[PDB]
Paper text:
Cryo-EM structural analysis of the human ACE2–Omicron spike protein complex shows strong density for ACE2 bound to the RBD of one of the protomers in the “up” position. Weaker density is observed for a second bound ACE2, suggesting partial occupancy of a second RBD under our experimental conditions. We focus on the structure of the ACE2–spike protein interface in the most strongly bound ACE2 molecule. (A) Cryo-EM map of the Omicron spike protein in complex with human ACE2 at 2.45-Å resolution after global refinement. The three protomers are colored in different shades of purple, and the density for bound ACE2 is colored in blue. Although the Omicron spike protein exhibits a measurable increase in apparent affinity for ACE2 relative to the wild-type spike protein [in agreement with a recent preprint (19)], the apparent ACE2 affinity is similar for both the Delta and Omicron variants. The cryo-EM structure of the spike protein–ACE2 complex provides a structural rationale for how this is achieved: Interactions involving the new mutations in the Omicron variant at residues 493, 496, 498, and 501 appear to restore ACE2 binding efficiency that would be lost as a result of other mutations such as K417N. The Omicron variant thus appears to have evolved to selectively balance an increase in escape from neutralization with its ability to interact efficiently with ACE2.
SARS-CoV-2 relies on a trimeric spike protein for host cell entry via recognition of the angiotensin-converting enzyme 2 (ACE2) receptor. The spike protein comprises two domains: the S1 domain, which contains the receptor binding domain (RBD), and the S2 domain, which is responsible for membrane fusion. The RBD mediates attachment to human cells through the ACE2 receptor and is the primary target of neutralizing antibodies. The Omicron variant has 37 mutations in the spike protein relative to the initial Wuhan-Hu-1 strain, with 15 of them present in the RBD.
Numbering used by the authors:
A (entry chain C): 14 to 68, 77 to 142, 153 to 176, 185 to 210, 215 to 247, 257 to 300
B (entry chain B): 301 to 620, 641 to 675, 691 to 695
C (entry chain C): 746 to 827, 856 to 893
D (entry chain C), E (entry chain A): 993 to 1041
């Protein structure tokens, strides 16, 4: 089942500063009291990160995945529920679906016939896809989830491995440092070039709860990571941002 | 031998190195949980017909093939294109379990390059088939005194099947020139015939339950692995370790480091693996390397004496006339509290001389 | 790896050359310390009544209170300086080098330059 | 293994060469220090500076 | 490309090694020149030659 939403208000997407966010642990290696240089897919410091609002604003465009995606969510009441990844988003190719409904977190890899406007709607109405024919992988996991919550996620698709890095912070974007812990290593082995996030409506037509999300893109670069005595990343340096950091 | 001379002058000469050899081999991997569902494939109560053969895909679990090999009722284990011994080591992306029921005489037709009613019309195997077939007698389960008519095979088709093709059509077979029009009259036959199993048939006509495992490896990161046997964990000795495919040799000691939950192995200042987390019991172990020493020989001239002393550089005396110095462990010299001028330098204020060899 | 060592043996005496060069450097460092500090063969000691005409040498003479037997200046200097690989200890320890400096200070304070050219 | 052995052997030779050059520099400095110990501490020097 | 890189890298390491040796020689000469400037120009020297 699909439903067209025709009550949107036209507005261009906003842009803001990334500050020092988007940092994640490059690997599963413990390090203590050392500075480590990594050449990985990272988000540049103070970069131009796209800002979308949910307020009548219902922002659900489909964005190119590129080489990696940083998703920031300034969220309260858990409106944002999941993401959709793929190339063509239809039954012609194979797509990845990440959802968190009221009970459990479901990861599926199927050839979904996706709706043009997929969404979630007690919660008893699910309109994401109309069909799923060839399902090759299923994975069920733990629950991932004034504005009170900052949810930071990093998605990468390297060598057929889809890495999900996550961080939760009690709270525009705040200015500070928070390292993203690796959460899910996913064996999909499929091509991903485009993604779309999934929202939840509130019905009383429908009303959108107050939420904001940010989309940033990863580029190959070197970061200098600082590891404390307990192995927690506390500071980072972008080697290509400014000459002072390049010297560092 | 080191100095290429039969006469050695007075002094200390570094000759070789001391290495503590590995005493045992330790192999570790995670707990063998989240087993695959081979019990739902092999030990099912009811199997499908050979024309509508069941296909079960096996993904994201641990696949123990050692159960299938070690059961004696599973008589036929004809494996083609891969050895049964190396199934536990070879990892594949996906495992297809095709399950059906045939007679005794047609077990040999489940093979590459074979022909017959089953190979042409019911289940066809490719010539480049990577996987094994498993067959066992099921006369006690699949046979009744009245006769079991729940099993069907396709006797007629207009063409042979492609490999791994399932044909579930019930269209009336066209054997004559006239059109059949759906009525099984002259020269028109229903293509599906029934295997009527009874418990009193010979070995060539008793019902055989066949499960064919087909293994494939794709570009996705292969997830169907065998069970990984774990050797019991030995600490405080220089042993070989294999933690999650990370091989090495070192002494394992209890660690005070507070690893984060994702973190498995730890690196030092020089990016060498100095700490590891055991995959079965979540505890942290330091990996000190096995003791390495420079073996130096302290001797006076061969004209004077043939007595020698051995200095193990940077090695404690408890791990090799034994005296412990800051330079290392000195064996063969007696420490004398008296102080003399330095004759043979040892280090850290310690010098050796011949008067027996004394160290002071 | 034993196979690596077997392949390594084909390259000859490179390992012996490297060890010999490092051994030469190692003995050279001890020779350097011996040349700089061991210039007297008598260990001179200062008199117990350390009065030298109003001249105060407390900051450079050894401190009896300290276990290392070093001067306040020397103690400050030591405080202000902070896989197949091994580090060999120096032949002369810090205590003995401090003792040599103490002997030189005692000779130059009680005897002037006479001790360097003969008897003190 | 031949590639790894040649790379590591070249690195070790480079390290030993650097150590020899630094040892020469430190030997020169130590010779100067011994000269200062003989001429400034064990005597009075008329050499300027 | 590896053959070219190892040859060029060996050449560059050789050049740096001779540069360091020449640097040591020039440093010794400069130290001698500083000693001459201190003892011959800034004072009168009783050292013969
Ligand atoms: C919601 O709107 C979209 C956009 O127009 C519809 O998607 C198209 O539907 C027509 C139906 O004939 C197809 O021919 C097009 O190919 C669709 N476009 C794409 C990009 O897939 C969608 O069908 C609408 N939803 C419903 C329930 O009608
Ligand atoms: C020589 O110098 C030392 C240090 O400059 C003098 O020691 C000081 O003495 C005064 C009073 O006696 C104390 O208040 C200081 O704390 C002392 N300083 C140290 C570092 O000990 C010493 O008095 C001087 N004279 C003699 C004869 O030793
Ligand atoms: C971010 O991008 C928008 C257009 O994509 C641009 O107008 C804006 O100036 C950019 N931000 C900064 C800080 O340059
Ligand atoms: C959440 O999704 C899973 C997977 O489809 C489903 O089994 C479960 O019933 C869903 N929860 C609710 C409350 O419907
Ligand atoms: C995908 O689905 C279609 C129709 O459901 C089917 O014809 C096709 O064989 C399937 N392909 C795979 C690889 O499963
Ligand atoms: C993924 O798809 C895009 C377009 O759909 C294509 O340009 C790209 O080459 C594909 N990558 C792989 C690895 O198949
Ligand atoms: C590191 O952990 C210890 C206890 O495990 C704690 O006392 C200390 O404050 C921590 N350091 C930092 C920088 O968080
Ligand atoms: C692994 O299994 C053993 C039982 O053999 C159990 O004692 C241990 O707690 C298990 N470890 C984990 C992490 O489940
Ligand atoms: C089926 O039952 C037998 C009888 O005990 C058992 O040995 C075997 O492990 C079971 N599972 C399979 C897959 O054969």
């Amino acid at each position: 089942q699909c439903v067209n939403l025709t009550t949107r208000t036209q507005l261009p997407p906003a842009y803001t500063n990334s500050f020092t966010r988007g940092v994640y642990y490059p690997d599963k290696v413990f390090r203590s009291s050392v500075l480590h240089s990594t050449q990985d897919l990272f988000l540049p410091f103070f970069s131009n990160v796209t800002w979308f609002h949910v307020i009548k604003r219902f922002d659900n465009p489909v964005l190119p995945f590129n080489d990696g995606v940083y998703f920031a969510s300034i969220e309260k009441s858990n409106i944002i529920r999941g993401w959709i990844f793929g190339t063509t988003l239809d039954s012609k190719t194979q797509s990845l679906l990440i959802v968190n409904n009221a009970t459990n977190v479901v990861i599926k890899v199927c050839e979904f016939q996706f709706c043009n406007d997929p969404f979630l709607d007690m919660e008893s109405e699910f309109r994401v896809y109309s069909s799923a024919n060839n399902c090759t992988f299923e994975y069920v996991s733990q629950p991932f989830l004034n504005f009170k919550n900052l949810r930071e996620f990093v998605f990468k698709n390297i060598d057929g491995y889809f890495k999900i890095y996550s961080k939760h912070t009690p709270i525009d974007l705040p200015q500070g440092f928070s390292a993203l812990e690796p959460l899910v290593d996913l064996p999909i082995g499929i091509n991903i070039t485009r993604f779309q996030t999934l929202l939840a409506l509130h019905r009383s037509g429908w009303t959108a709860g107050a939420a904001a999300y940010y989309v940033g893109y990863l580029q190959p670069r070197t970061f200098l990571l600082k590891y404390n005595e307990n192995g927690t990343i506390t500071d980072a340096v972008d080697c290509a941002l400014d000459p002072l950091s390049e010297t560092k | 031998c080191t100095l290429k001379s039969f006469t050695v002058e007075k002094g200390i000469y570094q000759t070789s190195n001391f290495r503590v050899q590995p005493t045992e081999s330790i192999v570790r991997f995670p707990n063998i949980t989240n087993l695959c569902p081979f019990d739902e494939v092999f030990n099912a109560t009811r199997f499908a017909s050979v024309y509508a053969w069941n296909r079960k895909r096996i993904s994201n679990c641990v696949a123990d093939y050692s159960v299938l090999y070690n059961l004696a009722p599973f008589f036929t284990f004809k494996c083609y294109g891969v050895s049964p011994t190396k199934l536990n080591d070879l990892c594949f992306t996906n495992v297809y379990a095709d399950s059906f029921v045939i007679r005794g005489d047609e077990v040999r037709q489940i093979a590459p390059g074979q022909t017959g009613n089953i190979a042409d019309y019911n289940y066809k195997l490719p010539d480049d088939f990577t996987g094994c077939v498993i067959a066992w007698n099921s006369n006690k389960l699949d046979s009744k005194v009245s006769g079991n008519y729940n099993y069907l095979y396709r006797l007629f088709r207009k063409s042979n099947l492609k490999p791994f093709e399932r044909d579930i059509s019930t269209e009336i077979y066209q054997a004559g020139n006239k059109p059949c029009n759906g009525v099984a009259g002259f020269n028109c036959y229903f293509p599906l015939r029934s295997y009527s199993f009874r418990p009193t048939y010979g070995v060539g006509h008793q019902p055989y339950r066949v499960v064919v495992l087909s293994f494939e490896l794709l570009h996705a990161p292969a997830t169907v692995c065998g069970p990984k046997k774990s050797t019991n964990l030995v600490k405080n000795k220089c042993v070989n370790f294999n933690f999650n495919g990370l091989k090495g040799t070192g002494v394992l000691t209890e660690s005070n480091k507070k690893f984060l939950p994702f973190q498995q192995f730890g690196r030092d200042i020089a990016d060498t693996t100095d700490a590891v987390r055991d995959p079965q019991t979540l505890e942290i172990l330091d990996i000190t390397p096995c003791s390495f020493g420079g073996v130096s020989v302290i001797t006076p001239g061969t004209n004077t004496s043939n007595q020698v002393a051995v200095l193990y550089q940077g090695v404690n005396c408890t791990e090799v006339n034994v005296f412990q110095t800051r330079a290392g462990c000195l064996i063969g010299a007696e420490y004398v509290n008296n102080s003399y001028e330095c004759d043979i330098p040892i280090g850290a204020g310690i010098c050796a001389s011949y008067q027996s060899i004394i160290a002071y | 790896s034993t196979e690596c060592s077997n392949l390594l043996l084909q390259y000859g005496s490179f390992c012996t050359q490297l060890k010999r060069a490092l051994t030469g450097i190692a003995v050279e460092q001890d020779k350097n310390t011996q040349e700089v500090f061991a210039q007297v063969k008598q260990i001179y000691k200062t008199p117990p009544i350390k009065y030298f005409g109003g001249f105060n040498f407390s900051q450079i003479l050894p401190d009896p209170s300290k276990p290392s037997k070093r001067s306040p200046i020397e103690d400050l200097l030591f405080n202000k300086v902070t896989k197949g690989l091994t580090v060999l200890p120096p032949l002369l320890t810090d205590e003995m080098i401090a003792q040599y400096t103490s002997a030189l200070l005692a000779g130059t304070i009680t005897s002037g330059w006479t001790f360097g050219a003969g008897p003190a | 293994i031949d590639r790894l052995i040649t790379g590591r052997l070249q690195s070790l030779q480079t390290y030993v060469t650097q150590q020899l050059i630094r040892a020469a520099e430190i030997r020169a400095s130590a010779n100067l220090a011994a000269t200062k110990m003989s001429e400034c501490v064990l005597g009075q020097s008329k050499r300027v500076d």
